[PDB]
Amino acid sequence: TLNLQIPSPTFEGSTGGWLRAAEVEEKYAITWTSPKEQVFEMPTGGAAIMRQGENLLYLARKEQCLALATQVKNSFKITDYKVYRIFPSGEVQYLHPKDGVFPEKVNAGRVGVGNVSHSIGKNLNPAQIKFTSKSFNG
Amino acid sequence: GDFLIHHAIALALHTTTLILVKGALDARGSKLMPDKKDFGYSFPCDGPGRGGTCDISAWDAFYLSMFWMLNTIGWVTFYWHWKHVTIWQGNAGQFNESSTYIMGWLRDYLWLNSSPLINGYNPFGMNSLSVWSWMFLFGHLIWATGFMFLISWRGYWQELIETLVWAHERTPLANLVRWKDKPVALSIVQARLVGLIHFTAGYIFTYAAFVIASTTGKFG
Amino acid sequence: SHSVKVYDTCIGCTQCVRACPCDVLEMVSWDGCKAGQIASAPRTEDCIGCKRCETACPTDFLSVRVYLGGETTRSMGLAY
Amino acid sequence: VPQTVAWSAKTGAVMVLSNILCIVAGRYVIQVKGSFAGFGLPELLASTSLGHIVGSGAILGLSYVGVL
Amino acid sequence: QSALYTHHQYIAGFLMVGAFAHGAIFFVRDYDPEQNKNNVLARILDHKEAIISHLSWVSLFLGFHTLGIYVHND
Amino acid sequence: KKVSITVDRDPVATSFEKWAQPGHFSRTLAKGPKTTTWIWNLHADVHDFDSHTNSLEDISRKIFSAHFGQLSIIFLWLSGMYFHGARFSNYSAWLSNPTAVKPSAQVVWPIVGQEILNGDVGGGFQGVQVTSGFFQIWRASGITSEVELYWCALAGLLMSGLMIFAGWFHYHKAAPKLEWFQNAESMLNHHLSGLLGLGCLSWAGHQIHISLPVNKLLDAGVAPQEIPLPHEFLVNRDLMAQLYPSFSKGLVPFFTLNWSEYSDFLTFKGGLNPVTGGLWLSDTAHHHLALAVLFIVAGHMYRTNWGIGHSMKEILEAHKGPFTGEGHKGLYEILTTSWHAQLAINLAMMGSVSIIVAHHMYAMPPYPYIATDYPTQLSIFTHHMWIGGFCVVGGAAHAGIFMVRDYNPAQNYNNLLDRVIRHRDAIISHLNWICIFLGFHSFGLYIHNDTMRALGRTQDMFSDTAIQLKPVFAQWVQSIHTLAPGNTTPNALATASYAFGGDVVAVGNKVAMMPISLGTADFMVHHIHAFTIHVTVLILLKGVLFSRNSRLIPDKANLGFRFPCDGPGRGGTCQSSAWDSVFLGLFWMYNCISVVIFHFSWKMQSDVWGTVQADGTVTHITGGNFAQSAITINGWLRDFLWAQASQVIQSYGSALSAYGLIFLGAHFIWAFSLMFLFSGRGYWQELIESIVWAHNKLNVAPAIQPRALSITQGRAVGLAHYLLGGIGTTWAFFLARIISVG
Amino acid sequence: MDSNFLKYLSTAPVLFTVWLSFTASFIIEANRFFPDMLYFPM
Numbered sequence A: 001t002l003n004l005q006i007p008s009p010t011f012e013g014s015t016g017g018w019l020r021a022a023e024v025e026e027k028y029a030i031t032w033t034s035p036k037e038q039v040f041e042m043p044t045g046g047a048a049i050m051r052q053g054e055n056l057l058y059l060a061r062k063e064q065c066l067a068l069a070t071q072v073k074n075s076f077k078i079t080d081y082k083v084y085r086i087f088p089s090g091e092v093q094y095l096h097p098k099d100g101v102f103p104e105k106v107n108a109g110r111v112g113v114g115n116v117s118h119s120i121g122k123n124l125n126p127a128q129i130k131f132t133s134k135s136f137n138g
Numbered sequence B: 001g002d003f004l005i006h007h008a009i010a011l012a013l014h015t016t017t018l019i020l021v022k023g024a025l026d027a028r029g030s031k032l033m034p035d036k037k038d039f040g041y042s043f044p045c046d047g048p049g050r051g052g053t054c055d056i057s058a059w060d061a062f063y064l065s066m067f068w069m070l071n072t073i074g075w076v077t078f079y080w081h082w083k084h085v086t087i088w089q090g091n092a093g094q095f096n097e098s099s100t101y102i103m104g105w106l107r108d109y110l111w112l113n114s115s116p117l118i119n120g121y122n123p124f125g126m127n128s129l130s131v132w133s134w135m136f137l138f139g140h141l142i143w144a145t146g147f148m149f150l151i152s153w154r155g156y157w158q159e160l161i162e163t164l165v166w167a168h169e170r171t172p173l174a175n176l177v178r179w180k181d182k183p184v185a186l187s188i189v190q191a192r193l194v195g196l197i198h199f200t201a202g203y204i205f206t207y208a209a210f211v212i213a214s215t216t217g218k219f220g
Numbered sequence C: 001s002h003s004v005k006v007y008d009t010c011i012g013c014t015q016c017v018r019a020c021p022c023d024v025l026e027m028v029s030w031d032g033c034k035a036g037q038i039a040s041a042p043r044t045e046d047c048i049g050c051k052r053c054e055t056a057c058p059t060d061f062l063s064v065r066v067y068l069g070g071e072t073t074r075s076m077g078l079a080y
Numbered sequence D: 001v002p003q004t005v006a007w008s009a010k011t012g013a014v015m016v017l018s019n020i021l022c023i024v025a026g027r028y029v030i031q032v033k034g035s036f037a038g039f040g041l042p043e044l045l046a047s048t049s050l051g052h053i054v055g056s057g058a059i060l061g062l063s064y065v066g067v068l
Numbered sequence E: 001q002s003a004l005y006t007h008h009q010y011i012a013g014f015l016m017v018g019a020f021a022h023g024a025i026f027f028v029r030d031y032d033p034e035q036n037k038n039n040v041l042a043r044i045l046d047h048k049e050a051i052i053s054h055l056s057w058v059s060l061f062l063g064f065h066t067l068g069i070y071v072h073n074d
Numbered sequence F: 001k002k003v004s005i006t007v008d009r010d011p012v013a014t015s016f017e018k019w020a021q022p023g024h025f026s027r028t029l030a031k032g033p034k035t036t037t038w039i040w041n042l043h044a045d046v047h048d049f050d051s052h053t054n055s056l057e058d059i060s061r062k063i064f065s066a067h068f069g070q071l072s073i074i075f076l077w078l079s080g081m082y083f084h085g086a087r088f089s090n091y092s093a094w095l096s097n098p099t100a101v102k103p104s105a106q107v108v109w110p111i112v113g114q115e116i117l118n119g120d121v122g123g124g125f126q127g128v129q130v131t132s133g134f135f136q137i138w139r140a141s142g143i144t145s146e147v148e149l150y151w152c153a154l155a156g157l158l159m160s161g162l163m164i165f166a167g168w169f170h171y172h173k174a175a176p177k178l179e180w181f182q183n184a185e186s187m188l189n190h191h192l193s194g195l196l197g198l199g200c201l202s203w204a205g206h207q208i209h210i211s212l213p214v215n216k217l218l219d220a221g222v223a224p225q226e227i228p229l230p231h232e233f234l235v236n237r238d239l240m241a242q243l244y245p246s247f248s249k250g251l252v253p254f255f256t257l258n259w260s261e262y263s264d265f266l267t268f269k270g271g272l273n274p275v276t277g278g279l280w281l282s283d284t285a286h287h288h289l290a291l292a293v294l295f296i297v298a299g300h301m302y303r304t305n306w307g308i309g310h311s312m313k314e315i316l317e318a319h320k321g322p323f324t325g326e327g328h329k330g331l332y333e334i335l336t337t338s339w340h341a342q343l344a345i346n347l348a349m350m351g352s353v354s355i356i357v358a359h360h361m362y363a364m365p366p367y368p369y370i371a372t373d374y375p376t377q378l379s380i381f382t383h384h385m386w387i388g389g390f391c392v393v394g395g396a397a398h399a400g401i402f403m404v405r406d407y408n409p410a411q412n413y414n415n416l417l418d419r420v421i422r423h424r425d426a427i428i429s430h431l432n433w434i435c436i437f438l439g440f441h442s443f444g445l446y447i448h449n450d451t452m453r454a455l456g457r458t459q460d461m462f463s464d465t466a467i468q469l470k471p472v473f474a475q476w477v478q479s480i481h482t483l484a485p486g487n488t489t490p491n492a493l494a495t496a497s498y499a500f501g502g503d504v505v506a507v508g509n510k511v512a513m514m515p516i517s518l519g520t521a522d523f524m525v526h527h528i529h530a531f532t533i534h535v536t537v538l539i540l541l542k543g544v545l546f547s548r549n550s551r552l553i554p555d556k557a558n559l560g561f562r563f564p565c566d567g568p569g570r571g572g573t574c575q576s577s578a579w580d581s582v583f584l585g586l587f588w589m590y591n592c593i594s595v596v597i598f599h600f601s602w603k604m605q606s607d608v609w610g611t612v613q614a615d616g617t618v619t620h621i622t623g624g625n626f627a628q629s630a631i632t633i634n635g636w637l638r639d640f641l642w643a644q645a646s647q648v649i650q651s652y653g654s655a656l657s658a659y660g661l662i663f664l665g666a667h668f669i670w671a672f673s674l675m676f677l678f679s680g681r682g683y684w685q686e687l688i689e690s691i692v693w694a695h696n697k698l699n700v701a702p703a704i705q706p707r708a709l710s711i712t713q714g715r716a717v718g719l720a721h722y723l724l725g726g727i728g729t730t731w732a733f734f735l736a737r738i739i740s741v742g
Numbered sequence G: 001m002d003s004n005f006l007k008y009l010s011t012a013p014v015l016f017t018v019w020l021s022f023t024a025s026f027i028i029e030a031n032r033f034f035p036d037m038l039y040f041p042m
């Protein structure tokens, strides 16, 4: 659940922020908690000061949010960040970390997607699967 | 001179065959990419990992061999035209004495026979060769334009287009007008193809204008 | 979207998941390797195709493989 | 060529006046160092160097414009 | 005569490049190894390294000495 | 005190051990090669000191000693030029007959027929003609014999030894601490007052006491062997006062401010010396003396141990306004902590100064008999133009390196750097638009003129006999500068240069300098120059401002200054680094400087340089074809490229045949560069796989595994061979043409 | 002689430069004393 009333870091603004596609197609939000007011680099260019307590920030791309998350993780030891997707209708979709546990750590209930049960050298030839809806993995 | 230019032709044929055969036989896979057949005949790369994999597909071998094909037909047609122009003039000894070194080719064939072509129009007037005089320069232009797609690559142009997208969205009286398709830079393979197309068109139009206007100016 | 596959040569080193800028990969439980974990790609609609995961993979020829496919707004990395 | 003059008592008066004006100005405007307390040798050197600079400029200009 | 020779020779270069390109496309899309066991095509693929290395050698041989003779004469 | 000398004694032992360990400076490289890439990496990061260690003190010590090593190499080079002038030159014969003896200070050995390059250069001498202008420099300095050149060569060699010893001493024996290097105010005071000020003062001393009497005797027609030695001019005041009577008055007019007494050897004449075609040496002596006074005055501005002086941090922090936030705050810390920021500023400034040198040195020839030495003029203009362009692009490159590596957003909150980063999109978009506008309304004029002349419509062209584009502002500035003597510079006898207007200064029936008129073609080519410079600025500035992040790659600073890409994703991220922007901007700098030097060569050959004959008419080298031909691309192709290349392609069998060989070889290297530029790494790696199979079949595969060059190295090698080929082609073409016809 | 200096002298660029200069000097002196050898005299 994204609290829209979380205060934002003090930023003077830039031309690198989100465009019309954020208000028309989709927008991303990142929240995190800091122990102090401190200066971080914006992923869109420029320096902003995050406040002590909670911080909510809006970006155009998921990669910008995760770059900011990596920056605050490796420079300020902040790991509680949450990344959401917001649609023009007002629907908020929680994205990261998806089950509360970071993806580099194994969590129960996760099911494997895209796993192939053989080595990469065992894929089928394109001539084998031509004019046929078989996948090249077999 | 004939000996040397046929051995140069043999070089160019063997090298173009090397590129094309190496592309065909490594099309299914190499040590750098053992699963290349899973990626098709044409794809940009496999990323900067494993040392970097620029131009690894067989389509890229076609793309590299196109320059060598242009080079070999250039050498063959240069030889044919210079030998025949010196023979038709009654001056075959000029070819016999000048074709054994490269400066003879540059001076007695390219520089010497360019004079009626580059004088198709001048500050004193114009004549019927002027169109070739235009087309020549036209070729020298578009060939060079091909270089832009073959030397500069995508990420620079994508960041420029991002700045342009911001400029159009923030400009009054123009943000009333909106694109239906998002502007992006040309893809990697597309840019290789477009640079090849401009390069090849410049090659063909430059040499066609030169050969027709030079033969017309000397003999017609 | 791009297609990301993980083959059973994976040793569960979690390097591809740490290298992913778009949170496409995650570690799930497995018994095929000594680490007891395998990479998986449940979120390939967010995959930009950067192949940082393939650069991170230490197994001779890669366990994680990215096949570039249909381009979308997310996969093209468009902030507009 | 702009007219310059040979040395005279007027030249000395202009140089002395410029030096004293620059000494007082250096007392008033120099930020890092009863009114002449803290007055040290580097400040005197700086003020008298500016005094020769200003005096030389004034002497050359007044010789240019005819005041001599 | 100049235009006709130049025209059909450039057409020839384009056609030969296309032949090798569509042969590469055949190897990607249509070559079934299991249907071509110990075939002439399979043995081309099995000594492709020798073929490419000897083409590389003959290209370097020709280029080194042809360019050397031209530069020597220059 | 606050500014003091702090030194560590014997920090690095002098030993040959690390000479036997290539890659010792880098922890990544010190493990030894496993692939050939290592070898390239060893030569690629070696003088990149900040990437080997994080200590600013060690980096600063390495930089100081490497600068000493460069000074040693420059002094050895200068000593070589003096020695080769002393022993292998026709300099005395040139001193006797400057208008008829071609300068030559290189003689080849006879081996394979290359003795043909020892051309008949006059003065009873055979050698390679030199265009560096050293003969004119030595004549201006008063060097009349080759013995003095031998002594100059010895002085250069001794200074080279002193510099290399100082480098070893100040790295290996007594290395200054970081606090010593971080004195910007003291360094600026000493380098403004002592390096530039005392240097100008001592060179003014040499000019007044040595150069002026020797050159006055030379211009009066005295033979160089009958001129008195310089020390005789020093001690015999009567001999000095015979030429300049004010020396009879001594130093009393200086100290009493009776300066007009010195008006006979400190002048403000302007124009050129009619005998030599160079600047009046008295004007240069007043110039260097006035510069000495101004520089010594400027060297007392900055605060040091005593309380007087400006603090540069205070000056920077006081200048801030309503448009600019915190203003210039934080820049002093950047410029006293980052060596790359200082290198960026100084490379940009040195490049701009070199370009200014090229313009001001062709237009106001400062050396005797250098104006009518057309090969020297063309060579030095082109050379300093190229050095300037390279240094400006290097300033952009090292700005990008600072932005990636040394920039800290915490210390840069809402200052000018932060606000520039925060409106980079507006900057780059407006620059992009103005570049497209300049390209259209400058190059499309040439395209329009090509089409109109080809279509037989001469009245529809942009020309002086057609629809006119008059350069009215530059013509007005030329009129002002021609009207200036007696009106806005009332004490100057002549104009600053005759290029603005005036008489035809001619020396030995050759034009030293004449008015350079500006018409429609000059309008079009100056706006072409503006277009090319704005596009180069666009590439370099976009690379600098987007070096850390962009909308495409939000974490670009983590990838570094120099990376090939971020993969085929996001549509393709190829050439996204700031390094690749420098790589493209070097091409565009090449294009810009090439057009600039072509404009110079054609305009000087067509409208300025030539022979003066009876009734005062000037017959120019190409006969004034610039006005009607430089308005079309066809005119540039035919009347400049095709016409003036006749000398380099017919040079075979003559002394200029080396230029023909270099012409062909540079075309070759340029074409060879396109293999690296147009291709990609994966093809070459797979071809290397096949070649490795061939070597493996004979059990001769190397232990160091051969790899294709990296993507960045492929770009760098292609760019290096491209620049070498193009610049060498222009080099050979210019030099052969101007030696033959000028 | 210092073994480390000898090991530096044994590096690939130094030995490459010395060997190629030595080879070039052979070709130069052979062409100085026996010039214009287009052919093997038989």
Ligand code: CLA
Residues within 6 Å of the ligand: D002, D053, D054, D055, D056, D057, D058, D059, D060, D061, D062, D064, D065, F491
């Ligand atoms: C008693 C006081 C006194 C008097 C009467 C003069 C009188 C004069 N001085 Mg003098 N001077 C004085 C005190 C005085 N000075 C002092 C105290 C100093 C400090 C040491 C100077 C230093 C000084 C210098 C250094 C020079 C003079 C000069 C002159 C003469 C000026 C001629 C003219 O029209 O200017 C010229 C008017 C111009 C408009 C020319 C423009 C000058 C340059 C080229 C422009 C530079 C501006 C640049 C573009 C930056 C502007 C851009 C901006 C937006 C940032 C004039 C007779 C000049 C002289 O003797 O010439 C023979 C000269 O060079 N003076």
Ligand code: CLA
Residues within 6 Å of the ligand: F063, F064, F067, F068, F071, F180, F181, F183, F186, F187, F190, F191, F193, F194, F195
């Ligand atoms: C008046 C004093 C003085 C002078 C003349 C210089 C001169 C120079 N400094 Mg410098 N420097 C000074 C004080 C001075 N510095 C102080 C006080 C500091 C500490 C804050 C520094 C810190 C400093 C650094 C960190 C660096 C320099 C560098 C340089 C060189 C710049 C390159 C150049 O143009 O060389 C060409 C100019 C020449 C004059 C060539 C000759 C060189 C010798 C050493 C001149 C010695 C003249 C001598 C004092 C008087 C003898 C002349 C005659 C009477 C016989 C130049 C030699 C750079 C360099 O290249 O270092 C090697 C560099 O990196 N300086």
Ligand code: CLA
Residues within 6 Å of the ligand: B011, B015, B018, B019, B064, B065, B067, B068, E056, E057, E059, E060, E061, E062, E063, E064, E067, F668, F671, F672, F673, F674, F675, F676, F678, F679, F687
């Ligand atoms: C004039 C330009 C030029 C030249 C000389 C070459 C040369 C070469 N290309 Mg190439 N290429 C070029 C342009 C050029 N290319 C362009 C524009 C493209 C399009 C992108 C390609 C695409 C291409 C491909 C795709 C392939 C080649 C291959 C080859 C090689 C075999 C052909 C040959 O003659 O071998 C003989 C070699 C030469 C003539 C090279 C010159 C050797 C010099 C003269 C030796 C002397 C070195 C000198 C002493 C060094 C001193 C330097 C020092 C002072 C600093 C050879 C290295 C093929 C290959 O690798 O085959 C094995 C291959 O697969 N090239």
Ligand code: CLA
Residues within 6 Å of the ligand: F043, F044, F045, F046, F047, F048, F049, F343, F347, F390, F391, F392, F393, F394, F395, F397, F398, F401, F561, F562, F579, F582, F586, F720, F724
């Ligand atoms: C004051 C001059 C100066 C200084 C001190 C530096 C210093 C530095 N630069 Mg910089 N740079 C400069 C000028 C300068 N640069 C200019 C003018 C340009 C524009 C071309 C650049 C462009 C530039 C780039 C693009 C990069 C640097 C980098 C670097 C760093 C490492 C350099 C290194 O290890 O190379 C080691 C030395 C070599 C590899 C030798 C290079 C040999 C050249 C390429 C060929 C020379 C050809 C010769 C002149 C003619 C041959 C012809 C003959 C064969 C016939 C170092 C901090 C690099 C870095 O990582 O910085 C952090 C980097 O990426 N600089």
Ligand code: CLA
Residues within 6 Å of the ligand: B141, B144, B145, B146, B147, B148, B151, B152, F432, F435, F436, F437, F438, F439, F440, F443, F444, F447, F535, F538, F539, F584, F585, F587, F588
């Ligand atoms: C001759 C070859 C050539 C040409 C024409 C161009 C053209 C251009 N380059 Mg480019 N480039 C080239 C080679 C070339 N490049 C090479 C070899 C490199 C390798 C390093 C680069 C690298 C490069 C970079 C890195 C950048 C450019 C930029 C630009 C643009 C500059 C803006 C401009 O001038 O707009 C005016 C357009 C022109 C002058 C093009 C010719 C148009 C003329 C006037 C005629 C128009 C007639 C009309 C369209 C006819 C319509 C007919 C209808 C049937 C279609 C422009 C599109 C810059 C850019 O895009 O930002 C502005 C930029 O940042 N280029």
Ligand SMILES: CC1=CCCC(C)(C)[C@H]1/C=C/C(C)=C/C=C/C(C)=C/C=C/C=C(C)/C=C/C=C(C)/C=C/C1=C(C)CCCC1(C)C
Residues within 6 Å of the ligand: B021, B024, E019, E020, E022, E023, E024, E026, E027
């Ligand atoms: C790569 C690709 C993958 C698979 C598909 C693929 C397309 C098959 C393949 C490409 C194969 C590629 C496209 C192959 C392209 C191949 C080349 C172009 C074939 C040329 C053959 C020349 C023949 C042997 C005629 C020779 C003349 C001789 C017999 C004459 C002798 C005599 C005659 C009679 C008369 C007098 C003269 C003398 C000399 C006395």
Ligand code: SF4
Residues within 6 Å of the ligand: B044, B045, B046, B047, B048, B052, B053, B054, B055, B188, F564, F565, F566, F567, F568, F569, F572, F573, F574, F575, F680, F711
């Ligand atoms: S530079 Fe371009 S082609 Fe090369 S690996 Fe990177 S994305 Fe692929």
Ligand code: SF4
Residues within 6 Å of the ligand: C004, C019, C020, C021, C022, C023, C024, C025, C046, C047, C048, C049, C050, C051, C052, C053, C054, C066, F569
């Ligand atoms: S290609 Fe990039 S975004 Fe896609 S899964 Fe791999 S690392 Fe993640």
Ligand code: SF4
Residues within 6 Å of the ligand: C006, C009, C010, C011, C012, C013, C014, C015, C016, C017, C038, C039, C053, C056, C057, C058, C059, C063, C064
């Ligand atoms: S990096 Fe490779 S081996 Fe490691 S977890 Fe990912 S797929 Fe498995």
